[PDB]
Amino acid sequence: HHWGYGKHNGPEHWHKDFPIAKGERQSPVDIDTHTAKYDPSLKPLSVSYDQATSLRILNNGHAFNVEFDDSQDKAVLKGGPLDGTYRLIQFHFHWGSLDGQGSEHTVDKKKYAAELHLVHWNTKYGDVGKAVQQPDGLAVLGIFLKVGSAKPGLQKVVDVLDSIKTKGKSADFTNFDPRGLLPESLDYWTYPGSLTTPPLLECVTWIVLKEPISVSSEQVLKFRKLNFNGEGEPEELMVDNWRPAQPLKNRQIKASFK
Ligand SMILES: NS(=O)(=O)c1ccc(C(=O)NCc2c(F)cccc2F)cc1
Ligand SMILES: [Hg+2]
Ligand SMILES: [Zn+2]
DSSP, rough: OOOOOTTTTTTTGGGOGGGGGGGSSHHHHHHHHTSSSEEEOOOOOEEEEETOHHHHHHHSOOOOOEEESSSSSSSSSEETTOOOOOOEEEEEEOOOTTTOOOOSSSSSSOOSSSSEEEEEEEEEEEEEEETTTTTTTEEEEEEEESSSSOOOGHHHHHHGGGGGGSSOOOEEOSOGGGGOOSSSOOOEEEEEEEOOSSSSOOOOEEEEESSOOOOOHHHHHHTTBBBBBTTTTTOOOOOOOOOOOOOOSOOOOEESSO
């Protein structure tokens, strides 16, 4: 039926409706640190989120997205392996039912508690719909979350989750500063990939940060209390909404650090 992360509609079944699942540049992938090539020609990332305008947070089944006003170059990502300017459109997480799993990308086979994806689209394409039909249409900034000390900048997100417990629910979410979610170092790995959820389009330049941010057990606990189901339907906890690592194939992971 409609795709999900359960036994009968999970990742292993997506190929039946989305053939691209067995494609050449699928994500996520495992990052083998000893095989990633240090590329000194990579520029530093330029994250300009000072004028970010968040608007809403919503539970779309699958996960919760915090949306931003992308009608103007307010919050952008440039530099790194990117050519052109990419506007932030939304951010979401993938997490697990236990602290030992949750991330989509893995580092030397190590899974983290969750992973944050900051989605940006290439402005040269006019709108996100066009951008998804291009090889360099999207840039997703991936940040790993480890369980440890609480992340202050994440608390506003955590407190509003009760308002969007079920699928289809949304809440006004203005004045949120995404800069509060970045680690201190911007060192990263990069490779050409795809969306990790259907349509699974291969239009993404992945930029995965080396340094994870730490969040408290209590903070991660609250993510786990969300529901995949809509109001009135039988409760299905939103946990393990992650796709397992895909084969790297003919791709090379570059690193911006030595
Ligand atoms: N986890 S991840 O790889 O960062 C990621 C990021 C964005 C999207 C998305 O915007 N879906 C929109 C969308 C549709 F729902 C249908 C067709 C095209 C789309 F762009 C999906 C997965
Ligand atoms: Hg594409
Ligand atoms: Zn994601």
